[PDB]
Coordinates of C-alpha atoms in Angstrom, one line a residue:
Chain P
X1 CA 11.7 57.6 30.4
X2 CA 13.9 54.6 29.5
X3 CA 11.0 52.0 30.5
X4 CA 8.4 52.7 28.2
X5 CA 12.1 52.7 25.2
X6 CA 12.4 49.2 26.8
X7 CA 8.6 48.2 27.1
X8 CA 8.0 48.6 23.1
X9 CA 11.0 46.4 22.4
X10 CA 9.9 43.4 25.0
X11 CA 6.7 43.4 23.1
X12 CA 7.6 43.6 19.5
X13 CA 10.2 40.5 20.3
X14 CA 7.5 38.9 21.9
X15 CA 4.8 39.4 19.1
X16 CA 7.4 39.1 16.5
X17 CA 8.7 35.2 17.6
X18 CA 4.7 34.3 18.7
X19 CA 4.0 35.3 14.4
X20 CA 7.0 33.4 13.5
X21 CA 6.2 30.6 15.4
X22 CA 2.2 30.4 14.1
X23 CA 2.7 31.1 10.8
X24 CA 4.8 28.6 10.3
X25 CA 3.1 25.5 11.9
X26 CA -0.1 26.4 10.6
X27 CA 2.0 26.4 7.1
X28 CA 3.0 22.6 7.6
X29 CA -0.4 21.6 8.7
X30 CA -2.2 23.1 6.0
X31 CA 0.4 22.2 3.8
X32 CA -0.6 18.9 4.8
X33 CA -3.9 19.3 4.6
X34 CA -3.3 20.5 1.2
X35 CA -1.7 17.6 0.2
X36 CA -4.3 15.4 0.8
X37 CA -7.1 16.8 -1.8
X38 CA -4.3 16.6 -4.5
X39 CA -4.3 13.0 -3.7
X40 CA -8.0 12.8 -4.0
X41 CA -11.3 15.6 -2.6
X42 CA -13.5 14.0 -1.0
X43 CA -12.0 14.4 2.4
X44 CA -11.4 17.6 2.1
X45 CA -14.4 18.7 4.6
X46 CA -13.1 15.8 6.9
X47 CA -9.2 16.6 6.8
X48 CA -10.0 20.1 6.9
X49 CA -12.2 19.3 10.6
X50 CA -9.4 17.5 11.8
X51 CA -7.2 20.7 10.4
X52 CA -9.2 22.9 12.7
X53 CA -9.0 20.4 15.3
X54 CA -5.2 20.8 15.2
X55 CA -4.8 24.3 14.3
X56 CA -5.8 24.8 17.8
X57 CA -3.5 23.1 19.4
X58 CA -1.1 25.3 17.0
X59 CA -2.6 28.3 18.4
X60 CA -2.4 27.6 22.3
X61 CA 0.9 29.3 22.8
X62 CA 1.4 32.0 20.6
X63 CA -1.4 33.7 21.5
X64 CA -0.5 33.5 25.2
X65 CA 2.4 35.0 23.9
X66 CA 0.4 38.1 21.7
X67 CA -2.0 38.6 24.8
X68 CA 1.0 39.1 26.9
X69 CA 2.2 41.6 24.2
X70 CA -0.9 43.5 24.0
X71 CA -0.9 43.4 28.0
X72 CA 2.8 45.0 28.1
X73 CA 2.3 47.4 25.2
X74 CA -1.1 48.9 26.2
X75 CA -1.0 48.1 30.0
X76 CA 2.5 48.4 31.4
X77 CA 3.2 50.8 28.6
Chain S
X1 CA -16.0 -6.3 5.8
X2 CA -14.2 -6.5 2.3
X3 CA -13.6 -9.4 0.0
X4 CA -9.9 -10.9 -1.5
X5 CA -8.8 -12.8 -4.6
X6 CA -5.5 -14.3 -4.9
X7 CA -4.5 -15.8 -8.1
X8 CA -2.2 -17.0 -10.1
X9 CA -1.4 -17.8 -14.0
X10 CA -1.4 -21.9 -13.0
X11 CA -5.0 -21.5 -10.2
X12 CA -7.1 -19.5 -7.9
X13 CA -5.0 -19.4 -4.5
X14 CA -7.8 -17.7 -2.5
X15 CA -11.5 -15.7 -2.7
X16 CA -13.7 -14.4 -0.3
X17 CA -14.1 -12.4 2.4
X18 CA -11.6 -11.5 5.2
X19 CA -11.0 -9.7 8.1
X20 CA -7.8 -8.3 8.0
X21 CA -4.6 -9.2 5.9
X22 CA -0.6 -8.5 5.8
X23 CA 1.5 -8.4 2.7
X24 CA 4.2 -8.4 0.8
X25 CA 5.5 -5.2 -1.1
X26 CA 8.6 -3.7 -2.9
X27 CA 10.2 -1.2 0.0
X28 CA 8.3 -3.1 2.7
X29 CA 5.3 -5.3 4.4
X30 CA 2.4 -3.8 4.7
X31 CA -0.8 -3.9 6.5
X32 CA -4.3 -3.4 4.6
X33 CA -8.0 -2.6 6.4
X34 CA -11.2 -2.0 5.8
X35 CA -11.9 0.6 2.6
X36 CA -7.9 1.4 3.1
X37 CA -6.5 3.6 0.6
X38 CA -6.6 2.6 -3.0
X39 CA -3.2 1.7 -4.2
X40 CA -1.3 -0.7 -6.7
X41 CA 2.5 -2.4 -6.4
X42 CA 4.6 -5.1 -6.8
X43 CA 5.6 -7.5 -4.3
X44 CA 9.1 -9.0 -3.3
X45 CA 9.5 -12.4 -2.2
X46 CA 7.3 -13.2 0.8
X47 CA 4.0 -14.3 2.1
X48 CA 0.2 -12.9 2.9
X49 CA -1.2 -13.5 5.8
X50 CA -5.4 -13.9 5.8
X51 CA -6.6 -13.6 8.6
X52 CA -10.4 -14.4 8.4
X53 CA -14.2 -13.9 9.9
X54 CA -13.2 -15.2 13.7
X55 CA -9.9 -14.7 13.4
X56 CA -8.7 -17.7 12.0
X57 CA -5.0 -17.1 10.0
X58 CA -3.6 -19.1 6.6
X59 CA -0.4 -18.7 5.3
X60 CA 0.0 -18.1 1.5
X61 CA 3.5 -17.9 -0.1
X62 CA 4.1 -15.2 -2.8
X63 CA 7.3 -15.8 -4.7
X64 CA 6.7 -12.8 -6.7
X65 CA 3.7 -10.8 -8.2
X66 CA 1.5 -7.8 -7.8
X67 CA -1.4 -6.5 -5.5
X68 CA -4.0 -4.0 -6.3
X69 CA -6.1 -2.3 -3.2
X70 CA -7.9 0.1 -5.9
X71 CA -11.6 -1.2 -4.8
X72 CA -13.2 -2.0 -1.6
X73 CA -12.6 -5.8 -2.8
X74 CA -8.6 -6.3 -3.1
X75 CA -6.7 -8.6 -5.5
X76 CA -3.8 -10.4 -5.5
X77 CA -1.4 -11.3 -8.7
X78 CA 0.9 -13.8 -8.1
X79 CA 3.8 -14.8 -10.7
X80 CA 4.3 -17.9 -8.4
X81 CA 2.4 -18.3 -5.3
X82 CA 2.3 -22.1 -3.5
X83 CA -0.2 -22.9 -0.5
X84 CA 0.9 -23.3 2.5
X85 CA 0.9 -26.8 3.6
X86 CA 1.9 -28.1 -0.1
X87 CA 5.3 -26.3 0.4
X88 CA 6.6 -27.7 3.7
X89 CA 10.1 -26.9 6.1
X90 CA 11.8 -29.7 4.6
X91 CA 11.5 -28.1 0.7
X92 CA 12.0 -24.7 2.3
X93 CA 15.2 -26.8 4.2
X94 CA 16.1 -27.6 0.3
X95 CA 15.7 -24.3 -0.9
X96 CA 18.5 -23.3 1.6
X97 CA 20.9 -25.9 1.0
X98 CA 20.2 -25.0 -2.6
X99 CA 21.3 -21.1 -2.1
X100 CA 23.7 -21.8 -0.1
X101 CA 25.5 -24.1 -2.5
X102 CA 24.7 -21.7 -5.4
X103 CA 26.2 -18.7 -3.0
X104 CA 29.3 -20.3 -3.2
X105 CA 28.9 -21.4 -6.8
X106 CA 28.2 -17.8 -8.3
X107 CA 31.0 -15.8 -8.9
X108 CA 30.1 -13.0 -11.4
X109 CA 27.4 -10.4 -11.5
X110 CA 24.9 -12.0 -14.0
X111 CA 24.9 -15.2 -12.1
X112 CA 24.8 -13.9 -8.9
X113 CA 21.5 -11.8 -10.3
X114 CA 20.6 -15.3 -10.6
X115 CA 22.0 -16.3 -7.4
X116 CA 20.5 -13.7 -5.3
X117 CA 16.4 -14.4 -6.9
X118 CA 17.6 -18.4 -6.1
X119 CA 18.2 -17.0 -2.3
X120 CA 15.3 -14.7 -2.2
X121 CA 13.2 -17.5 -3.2
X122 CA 14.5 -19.5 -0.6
X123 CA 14.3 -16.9 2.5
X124 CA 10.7 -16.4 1.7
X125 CA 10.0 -20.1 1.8
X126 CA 11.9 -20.4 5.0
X127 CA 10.1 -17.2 6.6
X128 CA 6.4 -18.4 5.4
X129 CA 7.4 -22.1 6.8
X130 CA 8.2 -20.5 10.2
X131 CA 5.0 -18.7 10.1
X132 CA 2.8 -21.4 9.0
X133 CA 3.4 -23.1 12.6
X134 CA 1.0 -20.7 13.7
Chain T
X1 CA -15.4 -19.4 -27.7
X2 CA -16.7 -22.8 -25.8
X3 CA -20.0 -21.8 -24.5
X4 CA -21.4 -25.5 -25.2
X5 CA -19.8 -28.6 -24.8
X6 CA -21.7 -29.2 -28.4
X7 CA -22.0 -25.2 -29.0
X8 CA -19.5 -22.7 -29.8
X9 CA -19.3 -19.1 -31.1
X10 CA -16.5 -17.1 -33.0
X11 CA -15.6 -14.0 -31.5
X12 CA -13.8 -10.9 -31.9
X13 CA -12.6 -8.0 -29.3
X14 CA -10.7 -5.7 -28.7
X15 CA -7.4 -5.5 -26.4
X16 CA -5.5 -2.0 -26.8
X17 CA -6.7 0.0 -26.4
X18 CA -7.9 -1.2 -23.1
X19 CA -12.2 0.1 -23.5
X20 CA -12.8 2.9 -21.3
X21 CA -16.0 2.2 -22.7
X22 CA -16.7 -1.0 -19.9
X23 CA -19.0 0.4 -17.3
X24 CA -17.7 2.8 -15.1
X25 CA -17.3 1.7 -11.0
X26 CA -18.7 5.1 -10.1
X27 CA -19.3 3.4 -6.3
X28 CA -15.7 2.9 -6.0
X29 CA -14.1 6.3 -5.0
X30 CA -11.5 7.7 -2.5
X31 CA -10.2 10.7 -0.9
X32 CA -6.6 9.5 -1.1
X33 CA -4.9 7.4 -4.2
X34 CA -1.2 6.6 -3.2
X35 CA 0.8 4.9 -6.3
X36 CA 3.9 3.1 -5.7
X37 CA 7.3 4.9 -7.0
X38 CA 8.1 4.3 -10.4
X39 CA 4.6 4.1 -11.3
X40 CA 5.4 3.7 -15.1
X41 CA 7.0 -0.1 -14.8
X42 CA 4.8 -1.6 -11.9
X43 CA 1.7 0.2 -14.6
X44 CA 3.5 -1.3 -17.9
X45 CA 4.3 -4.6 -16.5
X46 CA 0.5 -5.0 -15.1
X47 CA -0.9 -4.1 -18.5
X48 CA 2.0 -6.5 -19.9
X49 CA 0.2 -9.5 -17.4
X50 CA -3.4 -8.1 -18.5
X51 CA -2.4 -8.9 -22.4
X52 CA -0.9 -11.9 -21.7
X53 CA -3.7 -13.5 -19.7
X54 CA -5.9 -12.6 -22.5
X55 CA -4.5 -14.0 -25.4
X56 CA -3.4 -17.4 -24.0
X57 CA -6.6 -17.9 -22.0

């Protein structure tokens, strides 16, 4: 019936924002990071610890969002 | 920590070692630190601060020149560059009365290129004067 | 050159251009270099400074 039509869509606008959303910020940060080894490598290790230190912080939300997704569109169905 | 030379085409302002300094730069002042990263520029009218091993501050005027933060050990260049306590608030008092008169007494563009150096010169000298009471 | 107050020695060396030959400072090195806009005039005007200081000294 109409909820599972309905269902599908809450989760691919869900999913589809959360992908926006990450890909993006973890494009400026490692653009960043990036960056910085074209200005010299020898941080590169160093800035790229700190990258992963920060890409989480990127990550918190969207996948709260994507679980939430999966949840709807293999649970709630 | 790291080690400073200041100089100048008439003497050696400054060298040794020092805790922590603030100069001088084309856009804006900036702050250097220990193993900072390497750059070069010119400065605008202004001043250096040094602040030394126990914190102990001297004020060095930089009427114009370069600075170079390449190495560990930094360097100063300095086109003209007085110490602090041979310049004085009464010369920097002169220098204003000076650009102030010459303000008035500039009244194309050349001139006021000249003009405007003549009150940079003098604004710096009153800033480091100010900040040599310190 | 005055090495001596009673001893001197001619001399001749090189300027431009500027010996990459000199020892290299292999313990100075960086993971960021950050030049100052318009790095061509603040570079010329240096090397302009460097020339002069050795010919008149």
């Amino acid at each position: 019936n109409l909820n599972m039509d309905l269902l599908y869509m809450a989760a691919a606008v869900m999913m589809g924002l959360a992908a926006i959303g990450a890909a993006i910020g973890i494009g400026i940060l490692g653009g960043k990071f990036l960056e910085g080894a074209a200005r010299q490598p020898d941080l590169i290790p160093l800035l790229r610890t700190q990258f992963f230190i920060v890409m989480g912080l990127v990550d918190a939300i969207p996948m709260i969002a994507v679980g939430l997704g999966l949840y709807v569109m293999f649970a709630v169905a | 920590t790291y080690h400073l030379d200041v100089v100048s085409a008439e003497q050696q302002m400054f060298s040794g070692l020092v805790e922590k300094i603030q100069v001088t730069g084309s856009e804006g002042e900036l702050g250097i630190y220990p193993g900072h990263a390497p750059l070069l520029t010119a400065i605008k009218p202004g001043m250096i601060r040094i602040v030394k091993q126990h914190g102990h501050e001297e004020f060095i005027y930089l009427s114009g020149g370069i600075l170079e933060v390449q190495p560990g050990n930094v360097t100063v260049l300095a086109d003209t560059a007085i110490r602090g306590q041979d310049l004085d608030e009464a010369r920097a008092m002169e220098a204003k009365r000076k650009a102030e008169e010459h303000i008035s007494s500039s009244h194309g563009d050349v001139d006021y290129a000249q003009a405007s150096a003549e009150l940079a010169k003098a604004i710096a000298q009153l800033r480091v004067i100010e900040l040599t009471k310190k | 050159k005055f090495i001596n107050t009673m001893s001197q020695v001619p001399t001749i060396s090189q300027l431009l251009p500027l010996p990459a030959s000199d020892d290299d400072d292999l313990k100075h090195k960086s993971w960021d270099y950050l030049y100052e806009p318009d790095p061509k005039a603040l570079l010329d005007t240096l090397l302009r400074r460097y020339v002069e200081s050795q010919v008149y000294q």
